Design a protein around this nucleic acid. Structure first.
Lengths: 56, 120, 255, 259
RNA sequence: UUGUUGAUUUUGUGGGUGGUGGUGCAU
C-alpha cells in the first residue's frame, strides 16, 4: 500500500520552496496536479493511460 | 460570531455547491491548479512535512492563497461533512481531515466577508 | 430426414466457420489499429480544443446535503396479522414435533440411524471473560444479586454485529457462564437463599439465550465437565459429588 | 473537424464496434474519455451503430474515466437513447441483456445516472414499459440512501404520471432509511390527491400502482410520521382508498407510532 | 475502494425478497 503518497510526490527544502520531482501530465484535459507513475523504461499517466519517455 | 463559527457555515455552504477539496491529495491538486481560494489546515498534524508542504503551496508567489489553522483534524472533517449523523443528531463515526481547500464559495454570505476582511 | 439433418449440420458448420473467419478478420483489424495508435493519437493531441450547471442539477446537489443533515428513518417490515402469526407458529410447533418424534425413533442428525452408531462399538469498557476466573474478577466486587446485570452487560457490549470476532467471544462466554452457574451453587447460599434464587435462575435464562446460538461451545464445555466429574469420582468417589453437580445435570435437561 | 488521418482510424474503429462481441476493444477506442472532444470522436465512431457488447464496455470505460458532468452527457446522449431505441424497435418491446447491464454500470455513478436517465426519461414521455425495465434495474442494484432520497424527493414533486409512480414505488420498495424531509415529501405527495380548494389531482383517477405505492409507503414509514400526517393520510384512504388495497393501508397506517 | 479514483465501494453480523416470468380469463 501507499501511505502519505503526497509526501513523496512533493518535496520541500529548508527554505520551504515546493519542488516537483515527478513530471506533470502533458494532456491539457487532465490539468495540473496530475503526476505520472514513474518506471525505468517509461513514464505512465494513470488518468489518461498515455505512455511518456523518461528522457523527455 | 467567532471566526471558527464563520468557517463552520462557510464550509457547509461550499459543500452544497461541491466546492471543497477534502484531503491532502485533493488539496495539493487544488493548490497546484490555482483552484484554491482558501486553505484550512490542522496545526496538530503529527507529520511536520505535511504542514510544510501545504504552507509552501499556499504561500507560492504566483498564487497566494489564505491559510487558516485548526486545532483538531476531527472537527475540520466534521465541517467538511465526512462524519455521519446519529439518531440523536450528534456527529458519529466522524473522519478526521488534516487539510480542506475551498474551490467555490457557492453563495456570498456575511460570514465570508468577515474571513476575507480578517485576512485583509 | 438424414439429408435434412446433414444439410442442417453443414449449414451450422458453414456459419460457425463464417463466424470464425469474421473473428479472425476482427483480430487483425484490431492489431493494425494498435500499430497506428501512436500516429492517430498524436494528431488528436495537436487538435485538442482549448480550455453553468442546470437549475435541475443545481437543486439535486442541495438535496443530498440537506438530506445529509436530516436524520434518517428506520425501516419496518410489514406487520403480519394475528391469524398468520398464529398460523406461522403452529407449523413450527408441528415441524419441531415431527422432527422430535423422529429423534425419539432413532433419526440422528450428523439423517442417519442409531443402528449406524452400533457398528464396531463393541468390537473395540466491559470485558468479556474468556475464562471462569476472569468472570469472577470482573464480578468480584459486585454483590450476588448483581451478577445477572454484569453478565447481561457483557453480552450487549459484545454482540456479533458490533465487531468481527464477537461470536467466538460470546461462544466462549457461554462456556464461562455455565461454570459460574455451577460454581455459585457450590458456594454456600443458605444465608441469602432468596438473593441466590434471583441470581441463579436469571443466569440460567441468559444461558438459555446463549445456548440457542452457542450450542457447540456449550456442548463442548458440557462434555468437558462430564469427563471432569468422572475423573473426580475416580479418586474421591462421593466426595467429588457436590450440589453444583446435581445442578449441572438439571441445567442440561433445561437446555 | 478532426485530423483526416484520425477520421479514417476511428472510422475503422467504428466498423469494429458494429461487429465487436468479445476480445480487447481497440486501443484507440479505450482512450476516448481522456480526449476533451470525446463527443466529436464518439460521433465518428457511430454510437447508434455500437453493438450491445460495445455499449456495455463503453459505459464501463466512460463512467469510470469521465467526470461526473461529462459522464452525465455520455449517459444522456448515448445510453439513454439506445435504451429507448432498443425497447421501441424490439418486437416484444424488451431490452437487450447487454444494454440492461449498461444501465447497471451507469448506476455506479448515482448522480450522473439520476440526472441523465431517470429524470430526463420521466420528463421526456417515459412509457409504462420503459419505467418497468428501468425500475427493475433500479430495484436490483444497490443505490446510496442519500442519492436515492434526493431522487425520491424529485419524483414526488413532479406532476403525476403512472410511469413516474412506478419509480416512486421502486424507491419506496428499496426499503431505505429515508430522511424525515423525504418522508414529509412522500406525505406531501400523497395528500395532494385528496379532495378539499385543490387541483385536479384530487379528482384524477388513481391506478393500482399508486395504491400499491401508497400501501408501499405505509409499511415501513408508519413509525416515521407525526400524528397529524397520519390523520391526513387516513383521510386519503377514506376519500381515495382502493377497494381491497385501501383497508390494508389503513391497517398499516394505524399500526404505526408517532415520531 | 475504483480504473489513476474519491466514499460510488470493502469487511462482519442480521435480513426482505420468486419477477425486463409466462399462460388464459373477464371492456
Amino acid at each position: 500500500k501507499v501511505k502519505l503518497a503526497v509526501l513523496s510526490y512533493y518535496k520541500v527544502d529548508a527554505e520551504g520552496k515546493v519542488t516537483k520531482l515527478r513530471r506533470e501530465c502533458s494532456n491539457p484535459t487532465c490539468g495540473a496536479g496530475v503526476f505520472l507513475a514513474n518506471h525505468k523504461d517509461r513514464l505512465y499517466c494513470g488518468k489518461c493511460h498515455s505512455v511518456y519517455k523518461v528522457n523527455a | 460570531v467567532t471566526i471558527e463559527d464563520a468557517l463552520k457555515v462557510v464550509l457547509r455552504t461550499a459543500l452544497v455547491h461541491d466546492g471543497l477539496a477534502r484531503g491532502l491529495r485533493e488539496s495539493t491538486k487544488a493548490l497546484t491548479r490555482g483552484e484554491a481560494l482558501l486553505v484550512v489546515l490542522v496545526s496538530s498534524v503529527t507529520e511536520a512535512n505535511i504542514i510544510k508542504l501545504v504552507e509552501g503551496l499556499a504561500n507560492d508567489p504566483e498564487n497566494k492563497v489564505p491559510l487558516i489553522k485548526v486545532a483538531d483534524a476531527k472537527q475540520l472533517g466534521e465541517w467538511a461533512g465526512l462524519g455521519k449523523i446519529d439518531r440523536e443528531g450528534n456527529a458519529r463515526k466522524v473522519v478526521g481531515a488534516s487539510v480542506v481547500v475551498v474551490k467555490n464559495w457557492g453563495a456570498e454570505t456575511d460570514e465570508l466577508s468577515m474571513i476575507m476582511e480578517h485576512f485583509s | 430426414k438424414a439429408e435434412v439433418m446433414k444439410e442442417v449440420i453443414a449449414k451450422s458448420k458453414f456459419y460457425k466457420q463464417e463466424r470464425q473467419k469474421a473473428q479472425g478478420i476482427m483480430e487483425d483489424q484490431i492489431d493494425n489499429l494498435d500499430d497506428n495508435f501512436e500516429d492517430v493519437m498524436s494528431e488528436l493531441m495537436m487538435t485538442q480544443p482549448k480550455k453553468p450547471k442546470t437549475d435541475l442539477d443545481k437543486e439535486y446537489d442541495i438535496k443530498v446535503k440537506e438530506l445529509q443533515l436530516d436524520k434518517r428513518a428506520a425501516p419496518s417490515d410489514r406487520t403480519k396479522t394475528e391469524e398468520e402469526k398464529n398460523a406461522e407458529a403452529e407449523e413450527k410447533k408441528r415441524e419441531l414435533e415431527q422432527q422430535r418424534l423422529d429423534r425419539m425413533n432413532g433419526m440422528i442428525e450428523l439423517e442417519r440411524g442409531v443402528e449406524d452408531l452400533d457398528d464396531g462399538f463393541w468390537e473395540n469498557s466491559i470485558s468479556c471473560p474468556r475464562t471462569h476466573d476472569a468472570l469472577l474478577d470482573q464480578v468480584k466486587k459486585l454483590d450476588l444479586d448483581d451478577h445477572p446485570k454484569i453478565v447481561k452487560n457483557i453480552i450487549k457490549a459484545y454482540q456479533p454485529k458490533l465487531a468481527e470476532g464477537n461470536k467466538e467471544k460470546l461462544g466462549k462466554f457461554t462456556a464461562v457462564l455455565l461454570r459460574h452457574i455451577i460454581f455459585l451453587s457450590n458456594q454456600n447460599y443458605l444465608k441469602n437463599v432468596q438473593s441466590f434464587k434471583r441470581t441463579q435462575n436469571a443466569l440460567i435464562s441468559i444461558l438459555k439465550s446463549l445456548s440457542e446460538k452457542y450450542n457447540r461451545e456449550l456442548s463442548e464445555e458440557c462434555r468437558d465437565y462430564i469427563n471432569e466429574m468422572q475423573a473426580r469420582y475416580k479418586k474421591n468417589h462421593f466426595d467429588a459429588l457436590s450440589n453444583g453437580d446435581l445442578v449441572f445435570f438439571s441445567i442440561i435437561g433445561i437446555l | 473537424a478532426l485530423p483526416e488521418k484520425v477520421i479514417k482510424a476511428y472510422t475503422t474503429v467504428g466498423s469494429i464496434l458494429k461487429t465487436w462481441t468479445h476480445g480487447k476493444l481497440p486501443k484507440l477506442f479505450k482512450v476516448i474519455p481522456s480526449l476533451r472532444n470525446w463527443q466529436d470522436v464518439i460521433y465518428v465512431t457511430n454510437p447508434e451503430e455500437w453493438s450491445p457488447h460495445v455499449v456495455y464496455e463503453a459505459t464501463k470505460l466512460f463512467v469510470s474515466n469521465l467526470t461526473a458532468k461529462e459522464s452525465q452527457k455520455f449517459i444522456n446522449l448515448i445510453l439513454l437513447e439506445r435504451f429507448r431505441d432498443n425497447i421501441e424497435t424490439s418486437e416484444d418491446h424488451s431490452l437487450n441483456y447487454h444494454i440492461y447491464r449498461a444501465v447497471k454500470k451507469s448506476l455506479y455513478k448515482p448522480s450522473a445516472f439520476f440526472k441523465g436517465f431517470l429524470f430526463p426519461l420521466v420528463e421526456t414521455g417515459c412509457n409504462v414499459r420503459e419505467a418497468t425495465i428501468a425500475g427493475s434495474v433500479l430495484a436490483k442494484v444497490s443505490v446510496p440512501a442519500l442519492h436515492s432520497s434526493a431522487a425520491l424527493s424529485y419524483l414526488l414533486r413532479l406532476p403525476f404520471s403512472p410511469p413516474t409512480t412506478v419509480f416512486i414505488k421502486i424507491l419506496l420498495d428499496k426499503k431505505y432509511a429515508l430522511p424525515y424531509q423525504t418522508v414529509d415529501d412522500c406525505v406531501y405527495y400523497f395528500m395532494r390527491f385528496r379532495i378539499l380548494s385543490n387541483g385536479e389531482d384530487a379528482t384524477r383517477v388513481l391506478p393500482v400502482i399508486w395504491h400499491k405505492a401508497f400501501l408501499t409507503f405505509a409499511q415501513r414509514y408508519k413509525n416515521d410520521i407525526t400524528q397529524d400526517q397520519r390523520d391526513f393520510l387516513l383521510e386519503t384512504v377514506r376519500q381515495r382508498g382502493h377497494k381491497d388495497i385501501g383497508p390494508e393501508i389503513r391497517r398499516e397506517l394505524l399500526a404505526g407510532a408517532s415520531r
